Structure formats: structure tokens, C-alpha cells
């Protein structure tokens, strides 16, 4: 039996990860207390992959939560399906990351990453494989990046051979939220690159588009936006739960999706996403699903693949579907469109089918693409940070927190020396 702990950190991970648990609970039958008031037995035959059983039918979620300001924590609790987490898992830290990648990889952080690794270790020993981990963080910010990096580092430093699929909300391209959004990220990407195995850059501006262009959601709370993020996270780790045909776990994806050891930043995307009125007009079938699976509109990122190439893309389908139809649409959508998909690596697509479909749908899928176009989002951050380290702006803060100038230059260099590669192996 495999095992994945869901490390959460900061207002971002808290609400997003909370939504993760609510979605995965329902798909597994678990109620807002822990009792399996569910139906099919096939839902519990594999729950040791997200829920540790507590003497008394209370399947408790293995979820370590790390916030540096008891506040997004109170939110996690109040939330309906937010009383299932085990007290200890909640690692508070009355202080404030104060949106400073420094005040998170240096000050406030250190005096908490010790307690964090404690919870993690305990939950990491209670396993029979420790397949990997899963961090929910906001690359741009503090409690998300500062802690995220420190924790992600400590995890890889110790547990050496285990996956680490991070679902991060990359800084947006249009409007920003933290003036220090560039700095916070450049220092972060640096770490994420040399440490993780599979990020899933979930840009916010995207989810917003999906909310008004595909779903027509009029008044979109930060709740609806999360459900989308949840669908993906779940789909990716479905085969390591329910059964099916061509199963593919997390190492499978990575090994079959990471060309060279660095191009690991990937692009998410759900599949049957319809509308509040068009649904009655759409007919679900591997065909239709694809024209949407590949409709850049879905790709919840920010780099319309059209303006780049596609190293490797995996699509974990879910539901009773004919593999002929599956392989067909996959190939057909890899011939008609060919100038995009690269050629230095044939059979670019990667199929996968985990039978048991979503609860309330006939078929589904999760498109995870590794585009060379991701350079777009990166380029912005670099250029932004560029005009920010030059006129030495909003740095007095980070500097004081024991972060020498080079510590920033070195970082910029990397994302730039990470931007280059994407073009190097993005030219062939």
C-alpha cells in the first residue's frame, strides 16, 4: 500500500488544501467526522493512501498544516469538513511571515520547521512505502514560499527517494497581490527547481478565465476557484487509489514526463468542465473530452501552448471508456496539431485510465502538460525581479533578515539559466 501526506502552508495551501480534503472525502465516502457513510466497497479497499484509520471508524486525514500566524488555521477548523484533521497536525506559529521569503526561510520559519518535521516524521513512519509528498503553496508570498521551501528542502534532504508533487499558484501575469511578488518567487523557484519532482503551476489569472469564459460562474468566490484546483490534484493521484486498466502512479508520471532533470514544472487542467446551461447541450465522449482537454482555455496556466512547444504531456483519464477511442483521440490530436508537439521525443502523449469515474459524471480526465512555453510565466517574473534588484527596491526588508544581495542574484541567474534550457531543448 502506498502513502501520500498533504503538507499545507499559508492562506493559499490552507483554503486550497481544505478543498482538497473535502473533494477527496466525498469521492471516498468519508463524512465530516470520519465514518464511512459510503456505498461501494471499492472506496475503502484503498484509503490508506490519504486517510489513517483511528480506532473507531474515523478515517483521519494525514494532513500536516503549517501556518506562521494562527488565522488561516481557525478558518481550516470552522470549515464544515475541517474538524477531521488531528489537532497536532495543526502547527501554529503566532508571529507573521509578513510576506517576506526571507522571514520564512530564515527567521520565524526555523523556529517552527523543527515542529513541522516532527509531525511529518511521525506521519511518514506510519506507512508501508511513503510513495511521496504533496505541498500546497503560493510561490508568490511568505508562509507559502518561505515555509514551503524550508519544508520541501528538509523533506528531500531526509527522505531521499520519494516523489513531491507540489501544486503551486505561480505569481499572476496581469495583476499582482504582493508588491514583493517577484522577489518572493525568484528566491522560491530557485529552491523548487533543485529539490521537487513534479510542480503543477496553477496560475490564478487562469482559474479566473475558466470561471467566466467556460463555466460562466457569475459571482465566483475563492471557493469555486479551488474546486477546480482540487479536481486536478485528485485525478493525478487516482490510479494509486481506485482500480482500472493502464494504471500510472506518481513516479510513473514523472519518469514518463520529465525529459531532463529540471523541466518538471507542469501545466494542470480538468476535462468534463461544462457550464450551468450548456451542459444540457454537450454530449460526453472521448472525442468531445479531447477538444476540451487540449483547448488551451482549460490549461489552468498562462502560456497558451500555441506560443511554444510541448515536451511531454500526460492525461490520466477516468471512467468506463474504450482505449481505441482513447489512443485514437490522443494520436489524432497529435497529428492535426504537430508544429506544437516537439519531435526529439516521439509518442509525446501519455495515456492512463483509472476506471472508477468521478462521483456524478460518466467520464473525466486530468491533462498535465510540460510546455516549453512555460518560459512565458518565468520570463515575466525574471524581468519583473530584474527592475527590482537593480534600483534596490523593497529589499531593505529581506536584506535585514540576513539575505545578502548575491542570495537574490544567484536565484535570478537560476530562473534565467532555467529559462534558457526550456529554449535549448525547445528548439530541436
Amino acid at each position: 500500500m502506498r502513502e501520500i501526506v498533504h503538507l499545507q502552508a499559508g492562506q493559499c495551501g490552507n483554503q486550497i488544501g481544505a478543498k482538497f480534503w473535502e473533494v477527496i472525502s466525498d469521492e471516498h465516502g468519508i463524512d465530516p467526522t470520519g465514518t464511512y457513510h459510503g456505498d461501494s466497497d471499492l472506496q475503502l479497499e484503498r484509503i490508506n493512501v490519504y486517510y489513517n484509520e483511528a480506532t473507531g471508524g474515523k478515517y483521519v486525514p494525514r494532513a500536516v498544516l503549517v501556518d506562521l500566524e494562527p488565522g488561516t488555521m481557525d478558518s481550516v477548523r470552522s470549515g464544515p469538513f475541517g474538524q477531521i484533521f488531528r489537532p497536532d497536525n495543526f502547527v501554529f506559529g503566532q508571529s507573521g511571515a509578513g510576506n517576506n521569503w526571507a522571514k520564512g526561510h530564515y527567521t520565524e520559519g526555523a523556529e517552527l520547521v523543527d515542529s513541522v518535521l516532527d509531525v511529518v516524521r511521525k506521519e511518514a513512519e506510519s506507512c508501508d512505502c511513503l510513495q511521496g509528498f504533496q505541498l500546497t503553496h503560493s510561490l508568490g508570498g511568505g508562509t507559502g514560499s518561505g515555509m514551503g521551501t524550508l519544508l520541501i528542502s528538509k523533506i528531500r534532504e531526509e527522505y531521499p527517494d520519494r516523489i513531491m508533487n507540489t501544486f503551486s499558484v505561480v505569481p499572476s501575469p496581469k495583476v499582482s497581490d504582493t508588491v514583493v511578488e517577484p522577489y518572493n518567487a525568484t528566491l522560491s523557484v530557485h529552491q523548487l527547481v533543485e529539490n521537487t519532482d513534479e510542480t503543477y503551476c496553477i496560475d490564478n489569472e487562469a482559474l479566473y478565465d475558466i470561471c467566466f469564459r467556460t463555466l460562466k460562474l457569475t459571482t465566483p468566490t475563492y471557493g469555486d476557484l479551488n474546486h477546480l484546483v482540487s479536481a486536478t490534484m485528485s485525478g493525478v493521484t487516482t490510479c494509486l487509489r481506485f482500480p482500472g486498466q493502464l494504471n500510472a502512479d506518481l513516479r510513473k508520471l514523472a519518469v514518463n514526463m520529465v525529459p531532463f532533470p529540471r523541466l518538471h514544472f507542469f501545466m494542470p487542467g480538468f476535462a468534463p468542465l461544462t457550464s450551468r446551461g450548456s451542459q444540457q447541450y454537450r454530449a460526453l465522449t472521448v472525442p468531445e473530452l479531447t477538444q476540451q482537454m487540449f483547448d488551451a482555455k482549460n490549461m489552468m496556466a498562462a502560456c497558451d501552448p500555441r506560443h511554444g512547444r510541448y515536451l511531454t504531456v500526460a492525461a490520466v483519464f477516468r471512467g468506463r471508456m474504450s482505449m481505441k477511442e482513447v489512443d485514437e483521440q490522443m494520436l489524432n490530436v497529435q497529428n492535426k496539431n504537430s508544429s506544437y508537439f516537439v519531435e526529439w521525443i516521439p509518442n509525446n502523449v501519455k495515456t492512463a485510465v483509472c476506471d472508477i469515474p468521478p462521483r456524478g459524471l460518466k467520464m473525466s480526465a486530468t491533462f498535465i502538460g510540460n510546455s516549453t512555453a512555460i518560459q512565458e510565466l518565468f520570463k515575466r517574473i525574471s524581468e519583473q525581479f530584474t527592475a527590482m534588484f537593480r534600483r534596490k527596491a523593497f529589499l531593505h526588508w529581506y536584506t535585514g533578515e540576513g539575505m545578502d544581495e548575491m542570495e537574490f542574484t544567484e536565484a535570478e541567474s537560476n530562473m534565467n539559466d532555467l529559462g534558457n534550457p526550456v529554449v535549448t531543448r525547445g528548439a530541436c
Binding site: 534532504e157 531521499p160 545578502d404 548575491m406
Partner: peptide, 23 residues
């Protein structure tokens, strides 16, 4: 002056390489 950064980042890489040679 203010050597600081030299001993800091070099000490990081030394203790790093020492750790993955212990392992």
C-alpha cells in the same frame, strides 16, 4: 570587507557534500 557570504554559502555547500558522502 564583510566576508560573511563566503563562509556562509561555502559552509552550506561543504556540509551538504559532507552529508551526501555520509549517506
Amino acid at each position: 570587507s564583510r566576508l560573511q557570504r563566503q563562509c556562509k554559502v561555502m559552509e552550506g555547500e561543504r556540509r551538504a557534500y559532507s552529508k551526501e558522502v555520509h549517506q
